[PDB]
Amino acid sequence: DKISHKIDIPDSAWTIGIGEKFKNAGHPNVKYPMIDDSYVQGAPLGGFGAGTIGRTYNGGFSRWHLEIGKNKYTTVYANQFSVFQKVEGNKDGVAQVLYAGEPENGYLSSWKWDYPKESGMYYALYPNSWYTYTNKDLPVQLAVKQFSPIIPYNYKETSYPVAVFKWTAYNPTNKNVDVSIMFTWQNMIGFFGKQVNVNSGNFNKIIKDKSKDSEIVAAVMGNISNDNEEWNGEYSIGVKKVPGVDISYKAKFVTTGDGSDLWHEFSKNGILDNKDDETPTKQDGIGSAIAVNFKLQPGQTIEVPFALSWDLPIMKFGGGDKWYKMYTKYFGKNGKNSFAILKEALNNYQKWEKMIDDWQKPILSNKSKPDWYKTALFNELYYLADGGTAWENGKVGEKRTNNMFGLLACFDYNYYETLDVRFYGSFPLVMLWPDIEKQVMRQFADTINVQDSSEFKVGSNGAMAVKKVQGMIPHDLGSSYALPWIKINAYDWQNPNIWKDLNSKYVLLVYRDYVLTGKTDKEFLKYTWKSVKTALDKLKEMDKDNDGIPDNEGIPDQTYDTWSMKGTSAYCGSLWLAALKAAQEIGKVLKDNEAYIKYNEWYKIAQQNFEKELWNGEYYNFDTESDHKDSIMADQLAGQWYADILRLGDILPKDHVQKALKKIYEFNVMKFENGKMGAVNGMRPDGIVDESDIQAQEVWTGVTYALASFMKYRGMTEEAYNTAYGVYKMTYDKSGKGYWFRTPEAWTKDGNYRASMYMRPLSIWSMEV
Numbered sequence: 103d104k105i106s107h108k109i110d111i112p113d114s115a116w117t118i119g120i121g122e123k124f125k126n127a128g129h130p131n132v133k134y135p136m137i138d139d140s141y142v143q144g145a146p147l148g149g150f151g152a153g154t155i156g157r158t159y160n161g162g163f164s165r166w167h168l169e170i171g172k173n174k175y176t177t178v179y180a181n182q183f184s185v186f187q188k189v190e191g192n193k194d195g196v197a198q199v200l201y202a203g204e205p206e207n208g209y210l211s212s213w214k215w216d217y218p219k220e221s222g223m224y225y226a227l228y229p230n231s232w233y234t235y236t237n238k239d240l241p242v243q244l245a246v247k248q249f250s251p252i253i254p255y256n257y258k259e260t261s262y263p264v265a266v267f268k269w270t271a272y273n274p275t276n277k278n279v280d281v282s283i284m285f286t287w288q289n290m291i292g293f294f295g296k297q298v299n300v301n302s303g304n305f306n307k308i309i310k311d312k313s314k315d316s317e318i319v320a321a322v323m324g325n326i327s328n329d330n331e332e333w334n335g336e337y338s339i340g341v342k343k344v345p346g347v348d349i350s351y352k353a354k355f356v357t358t359g360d361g362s363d364l365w366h367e368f369s370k371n372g373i374l375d376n377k378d379d380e381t382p383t384k385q386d387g388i389g390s391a392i393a394v395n396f397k398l399q400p401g402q403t404i405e406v407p408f409a410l411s412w413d414l415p416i417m418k419f420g421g422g423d424k425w426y427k428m429y430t431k432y433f434g435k436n437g438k439n440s441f442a443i444l445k446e447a448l449n450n451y452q453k454w455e456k457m458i459d460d461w462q463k464p465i466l467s468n469k470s471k472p473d474w475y476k477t478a479l480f481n482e483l484y485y486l487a488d489g490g491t492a493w494e495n496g497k498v499g500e501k502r503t504n505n506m507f508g509l510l511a512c513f514d515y516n517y518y519e520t521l522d523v524r525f526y527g528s529f530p531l532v533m534l535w536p537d538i539e540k541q542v543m544r545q546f547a548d549t550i551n552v553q554d555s556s557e558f559k560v561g562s563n564g565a566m567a568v569k570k571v572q573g574m575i576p577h578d579l580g581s582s583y584a585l586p587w588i589k590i591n592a593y594d595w596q597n598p599n600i601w602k603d604l605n606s607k608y609v610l611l612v613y614r615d616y617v618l619t620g621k622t623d624k625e626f627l628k629y630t631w632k633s634v635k636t637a638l639d640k641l642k643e644m645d646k647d648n649d650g651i652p653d654n655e656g657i658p659d660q661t662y663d664t665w666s667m668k669g670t671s672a673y674c675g676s677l678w679l680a681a682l683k684a685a686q687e688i689g690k691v692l693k694d695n696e697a698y699i700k701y702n703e704w705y706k707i708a709q710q711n712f713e714k715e716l717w718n719g720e721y722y723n724f725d726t727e728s729d730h731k732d733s734i735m736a737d738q739l740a741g742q743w744y745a746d747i748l749r750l751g752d753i754l755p756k757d758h759v760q761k762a763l764k765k766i767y768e769f770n771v772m773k774f775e776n777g778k779m780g781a782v783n784g785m786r787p788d789g790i791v792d793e794s795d796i797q798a799q800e801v802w803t804g805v806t807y808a809l810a811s812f813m814k815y816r817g818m819t820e821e822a823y824n825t826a827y828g829v830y831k832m833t834y835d836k837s838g839k840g841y842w843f844r845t846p847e848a849w850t851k852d853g854n855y856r857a858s859m860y861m862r863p864l865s866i867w868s869m870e871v
């Protein structure tokens with residue numbers, strides 16, 4: 103490997119061999135079908151709300167999130183980079199597709215597939231990823247850096263449906279070598295959203311943009327229809343000319359054929375026919391190819407940028423609503439703008455690289471932090487793009503001031519902005535994209551007094567319940583299968599209108615968003631204040647026994663939605679205490695004296711009774727009335743965790759908090775698989791995992807990262823990082839279960855999982871507060 107010295111990969115990048123088989127991989131541990139796309143994954147490309155494309159460590163474009171809210175795992179084999187090399191003096195050169203695999207059927211059989219093992223590496227530190235190619239049959243070594251401009255405090259470039267592929271080629275040998283790099287792409291119009299005639303009318307054109315000291319050559323792959331539908335738009339691939347490279351292209355090759363129309367040209371001398379052809383297709387799939395060719399002398403290095411863009415302006419959800427995607431603000435809505443997007447990337451990628459380096463640098467340069475922690479911190483952010491992210495710029499047919507936003511909990515539980523989960527998972531938004539965060543919270547504020555008296559069947563017990571109760575915060579803002587932002591509470595496994603955590607978590611999120619953006623945004627507190635008061639007042643009515651604390655009802659009436667709580671729970675009780683203290687403080691900021699006094703009174707009574715009911719001398723009991731009420735819960739002091747972040751001080755005695763955290767580390771971490779897999783949710787005081795429910799026997803990745811954050815604030819530094827390390831290890835390490843770029847909600851002691859691609863582990867960013 104002589105190419106790594108010519109590029110700048112951070113030591114904390116996650117790494118794997120191209121074509122590496124992984125032997126330890128986990129699978130779903132549930133009864134019903136659950137997504138398992140395998141361990142062949144990579145860091146995604148594409149902006150927030152743009153739709154994303156997962157290019158895996160084997161080189162294939164395989165995890166398709168272009169249909170917003172859906173996960174489709176299938177390798178589009180025509181989408182590749184390929185290389186040609188010929189040493190001066192030899193009769194023939196060699197050509198190779200840079201993909202460690204081959205097609206299942208006979209399409210593209212002429213191409214040279216099966217990139218060999220032990221001949222290259224993949225690296226990822228989101229939003230960047232890299233491939234190096236160090237192959238004994240390729241004398242010139244190559245590397246690519248690929249990325250999308252995902253940039254904190256930037257709501258523009260961060261939305262773009264674009265990827266840059268910055269190639270570096272170096273000749274370590276003593277002979278001249280002719281080199282070509284080719285990007286191929288299928289015209290994917292009709293890949294989704296078209297019920298019949300899926301290729302019909304697709305056509306490709308070549309754009310040559312020649313301006314002094316600029317040449318870009320690009321293929322635009324679109325459809326003859328000017329219809330404005332979810333399926334219609336354009337894809338573009340292209341390259342910017344640099345000194346010493348020549349550009350060639352082929353506008354149209356057949357993807358549903360043997361591929362020799364293209365490959366016979368590329369494999370001969372690395373130079374394509376430059377054949378334009380705008381003839382639309384009928385049944386056949388078609389694609390385009392953009393190539394560069396250059397000669398590298400001994401010791402010479404050259405850099406060349408390619409790019410990919412996709413202009414699919416309309417997202418459609420299953421309930422029938424069509425919305426424009428955020429990036430349309432910047433490029434237009436007509437779906438004929440893929441070249442403009444591509445051109446912007448090709449002309450500005452160096453600036454974008456520097457902007458990404460500027461934001462990563464504070465963390466990467468901190469030599470007190472171990473590299474594994476940096477690997478997790480950056481790569482967990484993949485989910486902000488890959489979580490079915492929806493970000494609207496108007497309803498089709500509709501002009502408002504704000505752009506509504508939603509992140510899925512996951513794809514198996516297809517619910518936007520699940521608030522009980524976002525309590526953990528929204529840290530990167532408040533810390534890095536706070537205008538999005540506040541918009542999402544205003545969305546929730548607006549739902550507080552919505553009433554929908556129509557009834558739904560509760561999944562857990564078959565009983566009927568009201569969809570949405572006035573003054574109760576919703577579980578979610580809908581489903582991609584129905585009507586995001588419009589029809590809330592798509593979730594039906596339990597009735598969220600009786601949950602005891604949602605209203606408190608809402609208030610805690612509001613105050614968090616004020617505190618972590620500098621305690622300056624009084625207008626945000628003013629906007630949300632009525633909803634905060636309503637939320638707490640409604641929750642107070644669920645106190646059955648007049649101890650000043652809402653009573654859990656012997657059912658799963660909170661985020662642990664199969665784990666029953668009864669009476670006063672440590673979890674919901676501590677959240678309530680903290681929410682009361684937050685509301686007191688907002689009351690002071692907004693000069694609402696009567697609110698301050700009321701929530702102060704409620705807080706004092708609740709705090710006294712919480713401590714009396716639950717403090718056992720070593721930790722806080724799980725709750726007051728359940729069968730295993732003395733279980734040690736990993737999340738028992740979630741309210742105190744948030745109180746630390748919100749700078750609300752002690753809600754419980756410092757000494758008791760420290761004892762409880764040490765107990766959790768000693769039991770839930772260290773007695774669960776020797777502390778190498780995170781914190782199990784429930785442990786009995788005899789040191790055996792609590793078996794009352796599956797959720798008690800699970801490690802929750804986002805809960806564990808949050809607990810690590812809590813330990814860190816409380817000065818338990820070793821315990822914090824050891825606790826978090828288990829999650830990193832399981833996710834990323836060779837000794838783990840292969841969950842990179844699909845971190846699940848949960849695993850059991852065998853390492854098998856529930857709900858890959860989950861929002862909650864974004865909570866790792868609470869470790870950076």
Ligand SMILES: OC[C@H]1O[C@H](F)[C@H](O)[C@@H](O)[C@@H]1O
Binds near residue numbers: 593660
């Ligand atoms: O894993 C538990 C988790 O499962 C689903 F995502 C639910 O919608 C969430 O409310 C719940 O917290």
Ligand SMILES: [Ca+2]
Binds near residue numbers: 644
């Ligand atoms: Ca009570």
